[PDB]
Design a protein around this ligand. Structure first.
Ligand SMILES: *[C@@H]1O[C@H](CO)[C@@H](O[C@@H]2O[C@H](CO)[C@@H](O[C@@H]3O[C@H](CO)[C@@H](O)[C@H](O[C@H]4O[C@H](CO)[C@@H](O)[C@H](O)[C@@H]4O)[C@@H]3O)[C@H](O)[C@H]2NC(C)=O)[C@H](O)[C@H]1NC(C)=O
Ligand SMILES: COc1ccc(/C=C2\CCCN=C2c2cccnc2)c(OC)c1
Ligand SMILES: COc1ccc(/C=C2\CCCN=C2c2cccnc2)c(OC)c1
Ligand SMILES: COc1ccc(/C=C2\CCCN=C2c2cccnc2)c(OC)c1
Ligand SMILES: COc1ccc(/C=C2\CCCN=C2c2cccnc2)c(OC)c1
Ligand SMILES: COc1ccc(/C=C2\CCCN=C2c2cccnc2)c(OC)c1
Ligand SMILES: *[C@@H]1O[C@H](CO)[C@@H](O)[C@H](O)[C@H]1NC(C)=O
Lengths: 214, 212, 209, 211, 217
């Protein structure tokens, strides 16, 4: 029965995914009538490089994203008590969380796979290398340099996508201990932006990093 | 449940526009299109005097209008606009005419479509282009220029316009290595030897110097 | 509306429908006209003897399978289409050192007589010793372009002129062009029984002074 | 005979792949062990300006799925076959402290054996976080990098090594850097993100300038 | 005339029909097996040593790799297809061997169109041009005798009992070597070897490319 249990668990998961993905149309993304709140958090692993000839700095971090869709809900009892599953991020809608002052395309360092839970909640944690606009002047001093970069939806205003953080402290517990740069402070703060282009406000999380040469 | 219906209406709308009608074949002499173009310059990242290439980060505002993208909000739950993958729709082949590397795309390829058939698409880009930065370390600074326009469509198929001749500098990076003295964007009509029909472009002209 | 419908119908008739063109053959050979418009010598690297050019490449050919009567399609005489929608020649630099980087949209123009025009802009790194670039005489380098897999029995080449177009060459390049020629050649590679055709691009250049 | 052998191989691959949906990956109810081993070929570059080191290696991965089992007697005595990695499930084994996307240096083709076991040996170049200070001394420099599933906890994917010794028998003899030691060690981690423990294999390399 | 126009049409039809008969109404070759092994002929044409990096001991080559093999499943009778004796086809339409450099340090960069030639006897010719970075210590390159480096090419996943290799000559073709390269070639050979790797009881086959080169004076 126990290998049949294994076969049944696979059948159940295959069925769940078919039901969620093949027998319901793809979620069209958030709208003003159906807005979404994405929870964003950063785990900073390394400041790899600080280029004073171009004022670009390169970070490596894990970006934790979480949201919840009614359309991704199921009753575990209908599917052999499955409460969550992993799936390619290509299979589901994902928010267009973008750095606002990048100078190169982000490079993805991890597999793009999300965890979907039966309450319709999704957790997706892409590791990234980012080059962004930053003047490292002062990095070779006790006080160090300070740079900042905003992350938010590119195409969705606050009326479609809102953001939140669970804390305003960037997680430094995994920061590389032999980095060329030591972290003096790293914060992540929700902001409401008004851009002259657009009558609607855009929400971002402002990552502010203060750092110096070790 | 109202949220469920809103979703159905939007899915229904996109299906009607995209699955139940063939994608537009692009503009023609009999159905020409005007694309409105504007630039927001964010950074002059690098100026390489060994190769005379300069690297810009900007975003390009593109807007156009297609009758084939129109709908009556009243028959789709009063949906007035939606976001969609740029792959779902026709987009103009707006190209720099003096790039030295392929453009690097810095923003999601997603457009906004409105019920009157208008489309807005705002790609952010890093561009290397032909530019001699001689004088950048002087009070007068350096001046370079780069033309943007359709690669394959003449002025008889795609016209361009700008809403202003001033490049938007309000988001220019205040700690760039280079400060901007001026940045203009100006529609030009060109007659190239190759071709009997005039081509249209927007000439981005930037005057910049080493920040002091 | 009518014009749009006419163009969709034409493309559908040509593509979605009529039997397919499988590329040229000995029994159905093709001539491709090639020309170059040199825009910039970006870089000359004397440590590796590689030089980087930016140019566009004008390609032209004609297929009976792409012909139509404008009168049957509301007097449409040409259209733009994705290069992926049609056959295109495998024109290749014979001495590149890096993959070509494409700088322009991959879209071609098809005309009612069956002619296709395709003008890809490229950045190319190729084998070139720039020795002498810092002298009055300058350096000279050459690179051959032609089909990779089709011999002259399947693809022949020609030029409309042997002068490279320099009328868009960047006036403030690090390098001045002294001359640039594009010349059809016939190659007989001991590798292969049939002759290969190429257009040889020869560029004489020097540091701007 | 040859046409028969081919027809049989085609039939097997059909019955296995196109005659069920791809396996949905491991779960707590249907967990998997990946055996992981490294063969280090070269330390290409050590950058003391950014503290990044570049390694070239082969990563040996092995796992077993009941759903990939067959009776060779039903398929003309076929006991194993090669197939594109895209045709089958593969584990999301990831370096935890890379600084650039891994670059794949070998074909993405696996070997499947009739007992359901799969062997997949991707060659990679990896840049990862490493301070090379001391590389020009007798004791050399030591760096480490953890490899593990990105999204599956130890309750879904276990890892194991057959040996804690990295295979150095193909290490490039004229590298800029010589290897003093290289070990690969299973670890269990408890991350605040996640209630369930994660498993990794920690690669520790001690290296020095080859003089 | 009209006859000539028709002949061309018939030729196009005949080729489309041949490709369809081979590719559409037939199963893609599942690759070689111990029961159905395959011999691939490999040869190199070295065009340039582009660079020699003594800071990392990587050297970069540009070459053409000629590959040839033959399958019964690609055979046809030309008389059944208007005397068509060969055709060009995308390398994606056919099976191709996984010939790989065994000491690359970067992914190979492909410099030519991925198109093969298939002949009515079932033989296939495929000639990818590549830029390769590989492990090579160029110490001595500034000497009369130069530096020597080597790199093995072979199937990644198939042993010698599935994919065997051969050369047609022991000499790398230097007839189109770049005359103004930074490096002159002193010799370049290509030699079949048999390897025994601890992973696997079956022997593996490779062709070893050995190049002796020096800075041009
Ligand atoms: C598609 O293309 C063709 C063009 O080749 C086009 O067909 C042409 O239509 C024009 C306009 O009707 C025709 O021109 C006429 O020719 C006759 C002689 O045959 C003249 O008598 C006509 O002149 C009178 O009418 C003019 C107004 O139309 C007056 O200005 C003038 O004073 C005269 O009263 C006129 O020039 C022409 O014959 C055809 N040509 C062919 C080859 O058919 C067709 O109309 C185009 N299709 C569309 C939808 O536009
Ligand atoms: C007149 O100049 C502009 C400048 C920027 C934007 C859009 C922006 C910039 C702020 C971030 N998001 C957007 C956006 C909004 C919707 C789709 N794509 C991009 C614009 O569109 C209305 C016009
Ligand atoms: C010397 O002979 C030539 C030179 C250039 C072009 C095209 C150009 C030049 C630059 C503007 N864009 C085009 C174009 C036109 C149509 C398709 N693709 C590109 C040409 O074709 C009409 C012939
Ligand atoms: C000096 O020795 C040579 C010369 C030429 C070629 C091939 C060529 C010439 C360049 C254009 N294409 C080919 C080709 C020929 C057949 C199939 N694929 C490619 C060659 O291939 C191994 C060796
Ligand atoms: C110190 O802060 C940490 C530590 C570990 C992880 C996740 C990891 C560890 C590496 C393996 N994969 C994951 C993971 C876990 C869940 C989903 N996706 C990825 C993390 O995510 C934000 C923060
Ligand atoms: C010294 O340690 C070694 C030697 C050889 C191989 C495999 C090789 C040799 C190169 C060609 N391909 C393979 C291979 C074999 C089987 C499956 N996939 C790849 C190896 O893989 C972990 C370690
Ligand atoms: C759209 O709005 C109009 C008035 O604003 C209303 O009469 C109509 O019911 C709405 N149509 C819908 C929701 O389909």
């Amino acid at each position: 029965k126990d290998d049949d249990d294994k076969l049944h668990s696979q059948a159940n998961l295959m069925r769940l995914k078919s039901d969620l993905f093949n027998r319901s149309p793809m979620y069209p993304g958030p709208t003003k009538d159906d807005p979404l709140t994405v929870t964003l958090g950063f785990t900073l692993q390394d400041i790899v490089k600080a280029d004073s000839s171009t004022n670009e700095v390169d970070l490596v971090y894990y970006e934790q994203q979480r949201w919840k869709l009614n359309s991704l809900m199921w009753d575990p009892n209908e599917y052999g008590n499955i409460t969550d599953f992993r799936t390619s991020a290509a299979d589901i809608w994902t928010p267009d969380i973008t750095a606002y002052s990048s100078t190169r395309p982000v490079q993805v360092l991890s597999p793009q796979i999300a965890v979907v839970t039966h309450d319709g909640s999704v957790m997706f944690i892409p590791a990234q290398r980012l080059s962004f606009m930053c003047d490292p002047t002062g990095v070779d001093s006790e006080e160090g340099a300070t740079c900042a970069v905003k992350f938010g939806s590119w195409v969705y205003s606050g009326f479609e996508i809102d953001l939140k953080t669970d804390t305003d402290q960037v997680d430094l517990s995994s920061y590389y201990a032999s980095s060329k740069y030591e972290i003096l402070s790293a914060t992540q703060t929700r902001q409401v932006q008004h851009y002259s282009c657009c009558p609607e406000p855009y929400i971002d999380v402002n990552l502010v990093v203060k750092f110096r040469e070790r």
